[PDB]
């Protein structure tokens, strides 16, 4: 039936990712934003099933905001959570992904040429957003995303980091470069070696 | 069933609309245009009735790109032919619009600081779009909306004008100016007091 | 000389918005972020200054995002301290507006219920922006800006509201509708009531 | 001096390319859609000189949507022109470009498979636009820009095609499939090939 999505339990505990991310933004990001994702997009989707059905093409397409947003929020917040893992865990270090990192070197240069070319994207941002790494055809870029727009259709989503100021901002106030240098340590490079040689459909599976 | 939506007839002849817009124009805006937006507007809702059943949200959101253009495609033209008529129909006699047009003169001054007013906002659209006369409230405004947006936030539409190339060009060239100029004299303005009078509900009553 | 833009000082002391907004966000709001869109401005204002000189519209176009995100920011938060003073200023009173308030009780029916309609539209804005009461014409309209675009050309500002989450997370956390029902007690209407008065070069003369 | 365009002349008649495009769209396209770009990017910037000496900063913002659209006009048009040549030219053979075929090669496995790639590109525009082959770093992309905005700082462009209703409308009615098929027969290689091999500045050197 249509609309029956839940938050996601995370892979570990709110204060895991210390000191990367504090304990209490990890508890407001997952318990109150993406939730509320969660519950305005089953209830934007069960109202277009109704507008779907009789054929309400207006209201339709006053719908699409709502259900891009929350839906967009949805995928995002659950790549994200996916692709963290505490610094401590093997997961964390890149040897975990020989096939991604090669071609990332083969692309960048250097891993370190990568997160520089990422840090800057992220930097970047104007307002909210994300950056991602994706596979698209067999190649890997950097591409950014305004709000909650979820990876383009066509890409497959390797990692992401969220750029909304709710993401950093009661540990690192304005300075999200410290936000960016620390995410670092607890990315789940395992995570994106799997993302990285899957499919697009794969990359979702956790949304299921 | 999802997806059944058919061209309407014009509720005039091909050649009707002449000299103000050519017969070759019109067949080719309705018959093609027209029914091109209709045609791919029932596919994209066929795609989407199965990613909506199946909770694929990343589908939903891809397939929105196609619904809002071939579905406002749908909305636009539709309201479009009703509010044209022959200009020797006693419904291009802006008298037949008596409360729309006294509103009109109170908020711009005059029917003809109006229609400067709505050339002018035509005039400056770049790229392809539609200029339009709605409602909000009980007030008027012209808005603009690109490619082939609806006025579907709220605002009820009293008339629009096309302002693609493909709705000019073959007779008018680069020259909108003399198109605008020219189809005030097709706007029927008995179509444009009814919207006025009426509801958002009742304008869409036309896509039934 | 191009690019001198500098950063205002506030009309008030850091604290003087407590407790609606607490004198950490202010400090920081002021300090950092509004001074950071004053340097860039001014950078991008420079570059563009040879740009325009040199007939280089390649330059021009792609330096239009830094000038329209860093002007927009800098013109946006020059209006906000403006229109916010302590809560318990005269200016805070809605009596300090005769005139506006007349017109908003005309067009939405009453203080309260426009003050509702600002906050949803306020609530709605999805991602970092402004709200802002505006007039064009004769007439009064409310109209959220994304980022830091600038109200448009033709409308006159009559006051706004930053929901960019560095405005209120610190003190609301997630909560902004809280921040929403708080911000109106330091809403400086003796400013709202003279943009009101005066046309759009006159809101723009703070800079 | 600020603002001191003028409309470059063609590299060939107005009636050279064809039988793809015809004589009367190569004048119009020229003599007034491109002529009226340059003329208005010309008020424009004269008028952003006085906004900007008066550190007008509100002015500025509101000139920008000017600049760009039709500073763009005459970027993208100028760009075009240089590369389209006759079709019996030497230059219109693809062998003229042996380092970029090669790399189109590589990338989408064949000249053919990347005809097809940006042929669906093209035509996937919505509303008004162009499609390009552009060059990010050592890689070769397909990317659509909406409108006039030009190619995106930071890539090169390669070659352009316009999808502007007025670039064929007269010759295809609405029949952009033919148009692109035929639109190949005119692409100028050798232009191609020289921008490929430089950076983004020698691509624009002929604005001057
Ligand atoms: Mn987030
Ligand atoms: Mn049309
Ligand atoms: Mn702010
Ligand atoms: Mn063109």
Redesign the interface.
Same mark, same amino acid.
Do not use: C, M
């Given at each position: 039936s249509? +609309?029956? %999505?839940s938050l996601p339990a995370l892979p570990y505990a709110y204060d895991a990712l210390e000191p990367s991310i504090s304990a209490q933004i990890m508890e407001?990001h997952h318990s109150?934003?993406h939730q509320?994702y969660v519950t305005n997009?089953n209830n934007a989707?069960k109202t277009?099933?109704t507008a779907?059905?009789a054929?309400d =093409?207006?209201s339709? #397409?006053?719908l699409?905001?709502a #259900? !891009? %947003?929350n /839906? +967009?929020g949805?995928?995002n917040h659950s790549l994200f959570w996916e692709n963290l893992c505490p610094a401590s865990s093997p997961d964390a270090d890149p040897a975990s992904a020989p096939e991604l990192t090669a071609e990332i070197a083969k692309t960048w240069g250097s891993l370190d040429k990568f997160k520089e070319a990422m840090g800057k994207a992220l930097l970047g941002i104007? /307002?909210? /957003?994300w950056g991602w790494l994706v596979k698209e055809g067999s190649?890997l870029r950097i591409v950014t995303t !305004?709000?909650?727009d979820?990876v =383009? /259709?066509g890409e497959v989503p390797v990692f992401g980091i969220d750029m909304?100021?709710?993401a950093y901002?009661?540990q690192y106030?304005?300075g999200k470069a410290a936000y960016v240098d620390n995410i670092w340590k607890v990315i789940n490079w395992k995570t994106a070696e799997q993302r990285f040689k899957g499919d697009?459909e794969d990359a %979702?599976k956790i949304?299921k």
């Open positions: 249509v +609309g029956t %999505f407001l109150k934003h509320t997009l989707l277009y099933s779907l059905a054929n =093409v207006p339709q #397409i006053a699409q905001a #259900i !891009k %947003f /839906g +967009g949805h995928i104007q /307002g909210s /957003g190649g !305004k709000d909650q979820p =383009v /259709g909304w100021e709710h901002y009661l106030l304005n697009r %979702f949304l």
